[PDB]
Amino acid sequence: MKKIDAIIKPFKLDDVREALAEVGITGMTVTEVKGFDFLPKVKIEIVVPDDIVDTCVDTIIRTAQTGKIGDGKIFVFDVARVIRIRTGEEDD
Amino acid sequence: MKKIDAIIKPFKLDDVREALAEVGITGMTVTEVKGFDFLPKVKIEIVVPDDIVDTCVDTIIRTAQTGKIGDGKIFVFDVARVIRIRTGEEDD
Amino acid sequence: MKKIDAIIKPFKLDDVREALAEVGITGMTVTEVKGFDFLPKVKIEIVVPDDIVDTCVDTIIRTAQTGKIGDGKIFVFDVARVIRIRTGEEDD
Numbered sequence: 591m592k593k594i595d596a597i598i599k600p601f602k603l604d605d606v607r608e609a610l611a612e613v614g615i616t617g618m619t620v621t622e623v624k625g626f627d628f629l630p631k632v633k634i635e636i637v638v639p640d641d642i643v644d645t646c647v648d649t650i651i652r653t654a655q656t657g658k659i660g661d662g663k664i665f666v667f668d669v670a671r672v673i674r675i676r677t678g679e680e681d682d
Numbered sequence: 683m684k685k686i687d688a689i690i691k692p693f694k695l696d697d698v699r700e701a702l703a704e705v706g707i708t709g710m711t712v713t714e715v716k717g718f719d720f721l722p723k724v725k726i727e728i729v730v731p732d733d734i735v736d737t738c739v740d741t742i743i744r745t746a747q748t749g750k751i752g753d754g755k756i757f758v759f760d761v762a763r764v765i766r767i768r769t770g771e772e773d774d
Numbered sequence: 775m776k777k778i779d780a781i782i783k784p785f786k787l788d789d790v791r792e793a794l795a796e797v798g799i800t801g802m803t804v805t806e807v808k809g810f811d812f813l814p815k816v817k818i819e820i821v822v823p824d825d826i827v828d829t830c831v832d833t834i835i836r837t838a839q840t841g842k843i844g845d846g847k848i849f850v851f852d853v854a855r856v857i858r859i860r861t862g863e864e865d866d
């Protein structure tokens with residue numbers, strides 16, 4: 591699986607959530623951050639299966655972009671293990 | 683080494699800290715986050731040696747779980763380098 | 775590219791920003807975090823080309839250190855993909 595970090599404009603969060611939900615991604619973690627005096631941003635983190643990474647990245651690009659400055663970046667990371675606390679089950 | 687991200691219920695932080703301290707892990711970084719309208723969560727990040735990753739994951743699972751919905755996830759990442767700012771010493 | 779996470783004392787942020795700007799690094803994401811009852815810290819995240827990782831790490835070490843306790847750590851991660859939301863262009 592991969593972790594996708596998207597740093598976006600705060601008012602683009604509901605756009606991105608809505609569009610991701612359409613391609614079936616709903617679980618996400620959101621952090622308030624400062625982007626560099628600074629601009630408030632939100633950091634979206636979602637961990638998804640490898641075969642939907644492209645769909646997710648593309649979806650975030652399409653929805654979060656304004657064509658203007660400050661639209662933000664997407665960072666994708668390899669994830670070694672994913673464990674559910676409820677059950678102890680590993681990876682997904 | 684590995685970085686362990688645990689997204690948990692906020693009132694489970696002291697449980698997890700206490701239990702980790704028992705197996706000798708005390709250094710951690712904590713972030714307030716929103717989990718998906720949303721529920722407040724805390725993100726615990728700890729960077730540990732490879733041979734205690736299992737112990738830590740298991741400890742977090744045992745302490746943070748409620749058997750119910752919302753218990754959260756653990757994400758484990760490879761860490762390329764770990765440097766101490768005090769001394770410049772690399773990895774651990 | 776690599777992602778560099780530096781957990782530092784909050785009043786060291788402008789020091790680090792200023793010094794990084796000198797070696798040409800200006801884009802960064804900053805998060806308020808708690809370091810372990812706890813001390814307020816700031817988490818700096820910057821994603822940089824491989825050949826300036828050493829320069830950046832060294833710069834953060836030199837500027838952020840006080841020689842005393844609590845100076846913090848630098849964690850370096852491999853980054854699979856970096857995508858700009860404005861253009862959809864991948865990696866850098």
Ligand SMILES: Nc1ncnc2c1ncn2[C@@H]1O[C@H](COP(=O)(O)OP(=O)(O)OP(=O)(O)O)[C@@H](O)[C@H]1O
Nearest residue numbers: 625626658659660661662801803819820821859860
């Ligand atoms: N190297 C980096 N490390 C961590 N975060 C970054 C980095 N570069 C940019 N960011 C985050 O991205 C935000 C700015 O995005 P950016 O302005 O680069 O968008 P863009 O898609 O390149 O559009 P434009 O270039 O037109 O502004 C910053 O607020 C910052 O939080």
Ligand SMILES: Nc1ncnc2c1ncn2[C@@H]1O[C@H](COP(=O)(O)OP(=O)(O)OP(=O)(O)O)[C@@H](O)[C@H]1O
Nearest residue numbers: 617619635636637675676717718750751752753754
């Ligand atoms: N794909 C993901 N990316 C980032 N964060 C996530 C992801 N999935 C879940 N989370 C975080 O985990 C929290 C929810 O955990 P979750 O409800 O999945 O726990 P669980 O152990 O699966 O228990 P249950 O399935 O019974 O709820 C969310 O609030 C969110 O912050």
Ligand SMILES: Nc1ncnc2c1ncn2[C@@H]1O[C@H](COP(=O)(O)OP(=O)(O)OP(=O)(O)O)[C@@H](O)[C@H]1O
Nearest residue numbers: 709711727728729767768809810842843844845846
């Ligand atoms: N294993 C870890 N995982 C995540 N964050 C950590 C970890 N260890 C330390 N940190 C972060 O680093 C901060 C403390 O840094 P630390 O005190 O280790 O600095 P140092 O350079 O080792 O100096 P000294 O050892 O003299 O205090 C903590 O507040 C915490 O947020």
Ligand SMILES: [Mg+2]
Nearest residue numbers: 601602604605
């Ligand atoms: Mg909107």
Ligand SMILES: [Mg+2]
Nearest residue numbers: 693694696697
């Ligand atoms: Mg409690």
Ligand SMILES: [Mg+2]
Nearest residue numbers: 785786788789
């Ligand atoms: Mg200062």
